[PDB]
Structure formats: structure tokens, C-alpha cells
């Protein structure tokens, strides 16, 4: 079931974003690959 | 063009995150595959 | 290392979401491909 994201972070060493989820004991995350770059 | 996200959810059954968008009739979403897992 | 997201936007022309990061000079983003579609 869809559950809300309580905090979103991203990481330019791992090239992943991690979404902390509201569910159960509070220790579930969603995580996906991303590009990370400097604008301008 | 980039539009704001009003709410972000993720789902450990479908392995998707869904971003509700502020645009048009209010019923547009962005969605992507994700990993979902327990930590700790 | 993980850094906070300050703003999340998504774009139905590019089919990407972009996360502005709290890091460094403030001009780093994470960006990933997404589906974008109308619901209901
Ligand atoms: C002089 C200095 O410290 N420059 C920093 C860059 O080194 C750093 O870019 C990463 O550098 C490592 C090598 O140390 C590479 O393996 C990565 O591929 C580089 N990442 C990117 C996206 O270019 C940048 C960026 O820092 C990274 O991304 C941030 C958003 C954050 O997650 C940091 O923790 C992460 O290291 O920062 C310069 O200051
Ligand atoms: C006893 C009990 O209820 N255990 C729950 C797990 O079943 C559940 O893990 C999912 O289980 C289904 C089969 O029922 C699998 O098809 C999924 O692959 C499992 N998902 C994961 C990520 O392991 C877990 C996790 O719940 C899921 O993810 C949450 C973040 C949330 O989105 C839930 O709605 C979703 O079902 O929870 C245990 O309690
Ligand atoms: C009459 C009108 O303006 N209709 C709009 C649609 O054209 C638009 O759908 C995009 O249309 C372009 C060509 O104009 C296509 O290349 C895209 O593939 C279409 N995208 C999608 C997702 O269908 C829709 C949706 O607008 C897009 O997505 C929004 C979330 C936002 O990012 C917009 O800036 C973006 O154009 O909107 C209709 O109103």
C-alpha cells in the first residue's frame, strides 16, 4: 500500500535517493538510482 | 516544465513511488520504480 | 553521503523529477526518469 515519505535525501557518492517511510517500526525505506550534478 | 510535488508516497507491494503534482486538474502524478526494504 | 532535499519538482515534458539538494553552494540536484500521467 502507498505510505507517506517522512524524509527524502539523495547522495552524490552512491547516486541514490532514499525516502524514509511511515510504516510499521519506522525503519522501512524506498531507494532508487539517480543522476546527481551541479547546475549552472 | 517542472511543477511542484504536493505529496510523495511509496509502496512496498508495487515497488513504486508516486508524486502527486500541482498542475492542471490536480490529477497528474509522476511515478517510478524503487527498491523498498527494512533497515536496522 | 546523504543530503536533504529542499524542493522536489517533476516535469511531464522531460519525464523527469528533480530534487534540489541542501549541500555545498546550493546548486546540486538529483534527477531521475519517471512516468508522468493523468489519473481518474
Ligand atoms: C573538492 C571537493 O570536495 N569536491 C566535492 C566533489 O568531490 C564531490 O563530487 C563527488 O566526488 C567523488 C570523489 O570524491 C566522486 O566519487 C563522486 O562521483 C562525485 N559526485 C558528484 C555528484 O559529482 C561533490 C559532490 O558531492 C557528492 O554529492 C553531494 C550532493 C553529497 O551527496 C556529497 O556527500 C557527495 O560527496 O562535492 C564537492 O564538494
Ligand atoms: C506479517 C506481515 O504483515 N508482514 C508484512 C510483509 O508482508 C510486508 O512485505 C511485503 O510482503 C508482500 C507479501 O505479502 C510481498 O509481496 C512484498 O514484496 C513485501 N514487501 C517488502 C518491501 O518487503 C512488509 C512491508 O510492507 C510493504 O511495504 C511497506 C513499506 C508498505 O508499503 C506496505 O503497505 C507494504 O505491504 O510489512 C510486513 O508487515
Ligand atoms: C491543451 C494542452 O495544453 N494540453 C496539455 C498537454 O499537451 C500536456 O501533455 C504533454 O504534451 C506535450 C506536447 O505538448 C507532450 O510532449 C508530453 O509528452 C505531454 N506530457 C504528458 C505527461 O502527457 C499535459 C501534461 O503537461 C505536462 O506535464 C505536466 C505535469 C507539466 O509538467 C507540464 O508542464 C507538461 O507540459 O497538459 C495538458 O494540459
The DSSP call for residue A22 is: -
Q: What is the resolution of this structure in A?
A: 1.1
CB C32 within 8 Å of CB A35: yes
Helix (H) / strand (E) containing C13: none
How far is Cα A32 from Cα A20, in angstroms, rounded to an integer?
A: 12
Strand C28-33 vs strand C35-38: parallel, antiparallel, or unpaired? unpaired
B40 touches chain A (CB under 8 A): yes
For chain A, the domains span: 1-40
**Sequence-separated (6 or more) residues with CB below 8 Å from residue A26:** none
Ligand nearest to the CA of C15: 3
CB C12 within 8 Å of CB A19: no
- From residue B22, how far is each of A2, B3, B16, C40 by CA, in Å? 19, 6, 19, 15
Atom of ligand 2 minimally distant from the CA of B10: 32
The DSSP call for residue B23 is: S
CA angle B16, B35, B4 (to 5 degrees): 45
CB C35 within 8 Å of CB B24: no
* Beta pairing partners, B5: B21
CB C17 within 8 Å of CB C9: yes
Grid cell 541542501 — which residue? C22
Atom of ligand 3 minimally distant from the CA of B3: 32
How far is Cα A18 from Cα A6, in angstroms, rounded to an integer?
A: 11
**Burial (0-12, 13-18, 19+ Cβ within 10 Å), A40:** exposed
CB A27 within 8 Å of CB A15: no
| CA-nearest residue, atom 3 of ligand 3 | B24
> Is the Cα torsion angle A40, B6, B10, B14 positive or negative in sign?
negative
Query: Cell numbers of C29, please?
Result: 540536484
| Cα-to-chain-centroid distance, residue B20 | 6
Task: Report how this structure was experimentally obtained.
Answer: X-ray
Amino acid at each position: 500500500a502507498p505510505v507517506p515519505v517522512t524524509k527524502l535525501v539523495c547522495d552524490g557518492d552512491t547516486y541514490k535517493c532514499t525516502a524514509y517511510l511511515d510504516f510499521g517500526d519506522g525503519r522501512w525505506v524506498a531507494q532508487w538510482d539517480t543522476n546527481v550534478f551541479h547546475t549552472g
